[PDB]
């Protein structure tokens, strides 16, 4: 399937993924496309932060979902 | 019964117990030359039980080379008798006595014994007795540019604190069953292998909360190991680890035993073969003195140098020292054997005083054992140094002429220095200059400027000021004292009372700065330091920066066209806590202190400022409505402090204080717990009140409690002071009034057009007109830490302790609250002496006009562990501009007051660069993105007229130059840095 990842600068990246794909694979694709280290990627979907070790299906990600790519900041 | 009004700054370094133990120890000082008198001064300022002096030799002229309590009328009188009278005035709690003769048994009356200017045989005789009776023995010697210190505190010395740091404490995320302790995220404990820590508030592993210290095995910057915790539990969650400092045992050796096999301390690893040389050299010096009736080798004398070298060879053969003697160094030591410098004397005196404090207080790590130091790089090379030039002239500067010669003495006598500040470091620098004869010639002059006034707490480390001089300007008193010390400096010193800053440029202008020779800073704030650095860079004058912090110190030298500036490197930052921590969830006492300070400012300072400005500015409300961030808050404050809650007596002030107590300590906590209950969980399911967040609990007002009553009294007193009422301190009235107080009900609220402007207008018009209230002003409370009769620190301590009780944090006393809230910088006299000595050792380098950069040494030291280090200054970076070598810092462009267009054309045609930004001061004169109309309006104007128009202020008559910052791009558009522009008006 296809998904859209919106970045902090207003850019929209289209990705071809599957519901079974792991979060690690998505972070790898984002690192390959934008060069952002996975450690600094904070992926959010429907108000929940995607965590390594899980799959897209765990977060009920479906056709043409939208994710957010932000930086790791807390405080 | 420690006089906290005098030892305020020192107690932050040592502590109450340290000074209590120090106030019961006696110190004997043998030898009253410059080093001895410096040590005595430092010890008397320290606060020991008593000081005894022993020096029956008659005064001589050359002895005045480093003695500041001797005058030329005292020739022939024993030094101790003429020195005790002036030493007794330094401290009133420290009696000082004199003993004509010294007997061995008498040595049992003292806790520490300092020996200077004594033969080696007598030192051995004294040590053989002072070692077996467990008495601290410190022997110091200063020969020219060389110094030696030897310490022996017995065979069973006990050092409670080995580094002077506070125990390391931190929070824990999880502890495994294998003893692996893990910190929080991105949290470094900072422990080292072998340290001992104890754990508390550990959930899941109560056994670790017992408090028994355990070994530490460092496994990483964020985790460590303690061993096996199999029995105590499986896994532990959360908790706090705290370092435990254990006493250490240090065993020394007697002087006789340590002569054969000494233990050196190396102050620098670039010259590791020298201390073995000095060990032989000083013994040979003592032997030669014994062989010439105590007569040291004559300055720059070949025969005495050869004989001394023969003695060195004999001793080296005798002691089986497998070290090759350096002939050049030994002969240099021989030549400067009769030297007596005030800088080396001050340095060694500071060091020895710190060692005495260590011995008396059983604190900090001492020297172990020998310490040989030299500053041979300070020897002048631009003058002819020989036996003829270095012979004494029968003057008080003989001890320095014997090292540097008469020509360098004349060079010093014509110096024109500029000292910024007149604190402790300023006083030491002035003393050193007076001893050295600085600006005693016809063309010499000294200028000292400082606007502060002498306070009681400044007398602890500033020996030029006496209790009768409290409340006067520092510069005048210092100038008078140093003119008394050296009569030749009468009329050669100018004392100003002006703060060195942007507003004092009318006095310290180009004319003033064109006659100086060097600038020495004695400041305590970074802004003024960086301004003085900028001024020195503009005028290209050598600069001497020195800073101290507790027992640590550093000195830096800035030389034009050779080294970088002092503002180019700004290492030490500060810390400002995240607002979310301070506002809602504190977990340390510092957070509570900061919150209390903010509360004090918001309750007693800002509203009064708003009220006063309202009654002065005829258009205050309109300006605030469109300028202030919270006009509503300002209006509410004005209303409350004018009409709603204007007190008519002290009882109303007490009621207001009680109401504020309820508001800030009982209601906000209830609101917070209503928003975040104690059983609430985070988004991830973890409990909310866990880890850095501590569950609060509302406080109920109990008059019988000490802290509540203290807070009430302090708040009422401050409110009465604000409203100019008569305050009272009898508890009877407080208990009578607070009995009849009805607490207003409070229940937390869950919440659930353009009339706001109408409401603000309604509030505003309710205020009485300014014409109605003429001459009615409210007194703002200006924070003053040093005054103990204004309830400022009392109020801050009360608020901080109450907030700590809110979050179950450990309360702090008034002492630590004053230390933290007041931003008091710990200071010591020994550190001041050491930094002054280092700066004055760099000063003789500066006078000689040394050109190489390896001959200067920026110095750093930490007296808690006896650490000294010296490094070459960092060279100013170079750059390539227009295919030319340009210094980044010390180069500038000199241009006339041409028009902006002509300046742009000059930069385009000469340097081949395109100007893109041009600024001056805090204004943006020219930019590449400004609208063309503005540029066309500004282009045909001169720089002076442009600055006058932009800044809306005419240039003052004394102004003669402008400093312009220009950023320009090359032909390809690449940004290239260029030096600033010095426009000549």
């Amino acid at each position: 399937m296809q998904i859209f990842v919106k970045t902090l600068t207003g850019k929209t990246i289209t990705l071809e993924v599957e519901s079974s794909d792991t979060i690690d694979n998505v972070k790898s694709k984002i690192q390959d496309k934008e060069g952002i280290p996975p450690d600094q990627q904070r992926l959010i979907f429907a108000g929940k932060q995607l965590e390594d070790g899980r799959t897209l299906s765990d977060y009920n990600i479906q056709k043409e979902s939208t994710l957010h790519l932000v930086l790791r900041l807390r405080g | 019964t420690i006089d906290e009004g005098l030892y305020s700054r020192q107690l932050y370094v040592l502590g109450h117990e340290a000074m209590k133990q120090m106030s019961q120890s006696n110190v004997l000082i043998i030898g009253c030359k410059g080093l001895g008198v410096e040590i005595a001064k430092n010890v008397c300022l320290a606060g020991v039980k008593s000081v005894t002096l022993y020096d029956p030799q008659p005064t001589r002229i050359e002895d005045l080379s480093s003695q500041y309590f001797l005058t030329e009328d005292d020739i022939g009188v024993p030094r101790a008798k003429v020195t005790v009278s002036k030493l007794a005035e330094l401290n009133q709690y420290v009696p000082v006595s004199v003993v004509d003769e010294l007997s061995t048994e008498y040595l049992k009356n003292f806790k520490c014994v300092v020996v200077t200017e004594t033969s080696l045989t007598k030192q051995l005789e004294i040590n053989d007795f002072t070692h077996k009776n467990h008495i601290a023995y410190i022997a110091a010697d200063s020969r020219g540019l060389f110094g030696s210190i030897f310490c022996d505190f017995g065979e069973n010395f006990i050092c409670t604190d080995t580094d002077g740091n506070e125990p390391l404490t931190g929070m824990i995320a999880s502890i495994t069953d294998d003893g692996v302790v893990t910190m929080l995220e991105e949290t470094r404990h900072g422990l080292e292998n072998g340290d001992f820590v104890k754990f508390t508030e550990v959930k899941g592993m109560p056994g670790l909360n017992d408090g028994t210290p355990r070994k530490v095995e460092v496994k990483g910057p964020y985790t460590f190991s303690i061993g096996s915790v199999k029995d105590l539990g499986s896994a532990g969650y959360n908790g706090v680890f705290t370092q435990v400092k254990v006493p250490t045992k240090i065993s020394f050796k007697s002087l006789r035993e340590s002569l054969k096999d000494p233990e050196y301390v190396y102050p620098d690893f670039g010259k590791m073969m020298r201390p073995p040389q000095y060990h032989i050299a000083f013994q040979a010096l003592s032997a030669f003195a014994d062989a010439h009736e105590g007569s040291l080798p004559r300055p720059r004398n070949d025969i005495d140098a050869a004989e001394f070298f023969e003695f060195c060879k004999k001793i080296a053969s005798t002691l089986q020292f497998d070290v090759e003697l350096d002939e050049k160094l030994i002969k240099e030591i021989s030549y400067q054997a009769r030297g007596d410098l005030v800088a080396m004397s001050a340095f060694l005196g500071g060091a020895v005083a710190q060692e005495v404090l260590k011995a008396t207080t059983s604190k900090f790590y001492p020297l172990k054992q020998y310490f040989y130091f030299d500053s041979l790089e300070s020897l002048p090379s631009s003058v002819t140094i020989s036996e003829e030039t270095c012979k004494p002239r029968g003057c008080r500067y003989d001890g320095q002429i014997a090292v540097f010669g008469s020509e360098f003495q004349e060079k010093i006598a014509s110096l024109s220095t500029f000292l910024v500040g007149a604190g402790a470091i300023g006083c030491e620098m002035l003393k050193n200059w007076a001893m050295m004869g600085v600006a005693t010639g016809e063309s010499g002059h000294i200028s000292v400027t400082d606007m502060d006034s002498i306070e009681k707490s400044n007398l602890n480390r500033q020996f030029l000021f006496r209790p009768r001089d409290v409340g006067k300007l520092k510069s005048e008193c210092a100038s008078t004292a140093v003119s008394i010390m050296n009569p030749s400096l009468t009329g050669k010193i100018t004392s100003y009372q002006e703060r060195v800053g942007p507003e004092s440029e009318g006095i310290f202008g180009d004319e003033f700065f064109e006659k100086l020779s060097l600038v020495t800073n004695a400041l305590d704030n970074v802004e003024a330091r960086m301004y003085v650095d900028r001024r020195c860079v503009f005028f290209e004058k050598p600069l001497l920066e020195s800073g101290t912090l507790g027992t640590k110190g550093n000195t830096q030298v800035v030389v034009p066209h050779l080294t970088e500036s002092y503002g180019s490197s700004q290492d030490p930052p500060e810390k400002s806590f995240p607002i979310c921590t301070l506002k809602n969830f504190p977990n340390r006492i510092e957070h509570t202190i900061a919150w209390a300070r903010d509360l004090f400012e918001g309750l007693f300072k800002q509203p009064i400022d708003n009220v006063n400005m309202y009654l002065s500015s005829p258009n205050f409300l309109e300006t605030s409505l469109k300028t202030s961030s919270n006009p509503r808050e300002v209006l509410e404050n004005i209303r409350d402090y004018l009409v709603t809650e204007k007190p008519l007596s002290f009882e109303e002030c007490i009621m207001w204080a009680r109401l504020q107590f309820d508001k800030f300590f009982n209601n906000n906590i209830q609101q917070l717990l209503f928003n975040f209950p104690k059983d609430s969980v985070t988004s991830t399911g973890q409990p909310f009140w866990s880890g850095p967040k501590r569950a609060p609990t509302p406080l109920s007002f109990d008059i019988h409690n000490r802290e509540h009553f203290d807070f009430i009294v302090a708040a009422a007193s401050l409110y009465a002071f604000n409203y100019g009422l008569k305050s009272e301190t009898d508890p009877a009235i407080y208990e009578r009034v607070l009995a009849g107080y009805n607490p207003p009900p409070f229940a937390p609220k869950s919440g659930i057009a353009n009339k706001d402007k109408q409401e603000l207008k309604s509030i505003a018009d309710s205020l009485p007109p300014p014409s109605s209230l003429v001459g009615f002003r409210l007194t703002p409370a200006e924070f003053e830490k040093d005054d103990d009769s204004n309830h400022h620190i009392d109020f801050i301590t009360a608020a901080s302790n109450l907030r700590a009780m809110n979050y179950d944090i450990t309360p702090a006393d008034r002492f630590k609250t004053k230390f933290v809230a007041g931003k008091i910088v710990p200071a010591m006299c020994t550190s001041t002496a050491v930094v002054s000595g280092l700066v004055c050792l760099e000063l003789v380098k500066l006078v000689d006009g040394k050109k190489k950069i390896e001959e200067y040494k920026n110095g750093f030291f930490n007296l808690a562990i006896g650490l000294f280090t010296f490094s070459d200054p960092i060279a100013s970076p170079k750059m390539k501009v227009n295919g030319k070598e340009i210094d980044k810092i010390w180069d500038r462009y000199n241009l006339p007051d041409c028009t902006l267009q002509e300046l742009i054309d000059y930069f385009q045609k000469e340097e081949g660069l395109e100007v893109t930004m041009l600024s001056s001061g805090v204004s943006l004169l020219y930019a590449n993105f400004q609208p063309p109309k503005k540029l066309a309006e500004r282009l045909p104007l001169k720089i002076s007229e442009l600055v006058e128009q932009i800044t809306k202020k005419k240039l003052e008559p004394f102004r003669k130059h402008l400093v312009l910052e220009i950023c320009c791009d090359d032909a390809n558009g690449e940004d290239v840095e260029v030096p600033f522009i010095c426009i000549k008006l």
């Binding site: 108000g47 900041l73 | 802004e527 400002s576 919440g751 600024s919 204004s923 950023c967």
Partner: protein, 147 residues
């Protein structure tokens, strides 16, 4: 100081933020009035928020003072316009740039952090009743961020 300020200003000019615009007040480099556009995928969509930036005399050794001016209904932004961020308090290295400061602010607006809030009541409402939080944020960004 002035040199670094102008370098950052030129970098902003050459590189279009496309959602923000920070500029000095009049001809003073120590006072800027920046603008931030409400994120599309947020209740604050279609809003313009003004910020005041006071550069300390020790810049970049000390963090700039950034304060919101337009009223905004955010859990991590109080009434006085104060912002809750580490890079302004103690994470202020000399390596930071207003550029990134603004990036950060925008990322915050994109997703709040209610676990460590600055306004407890708004955080509680956001955690409990999401719809009420959405409505309040939309109302505030319509009342203040528009017009």
């Amino acid at each position: 100081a002035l040199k670094r300020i102008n370098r950052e200003l030129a970098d902003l000019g050459k590189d279009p933020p496309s959602s923000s615009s920070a500029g000095p007040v009049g001809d003073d480099l120590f006072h800027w009035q920046a603008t931030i556009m409400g994120p599309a995928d947020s209740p604050y969509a279609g809003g313009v928020f003004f910020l005041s930036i006071h550069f300390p005399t020790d810049y970049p050794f000390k963090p700039p003072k950034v304060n919101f001016t337009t009223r905004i209904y955010h859990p991590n932004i109080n009434s006085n316009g104060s912002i809750c961020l580490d890079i302004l308090r103690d994470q202020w290295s000399p390596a930071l740039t207003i550029s990134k400061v603004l990036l950060s602010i925008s990322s915050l607006l994109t997703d709040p952090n209610p676990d460590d809030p600055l306004v407890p009541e708004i955080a509680h409402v956001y955690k409990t009743d999401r719809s009420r939080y959405e409505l309040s944020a939309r109302e505030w960004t319509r009342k203040y961020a528009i017009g």
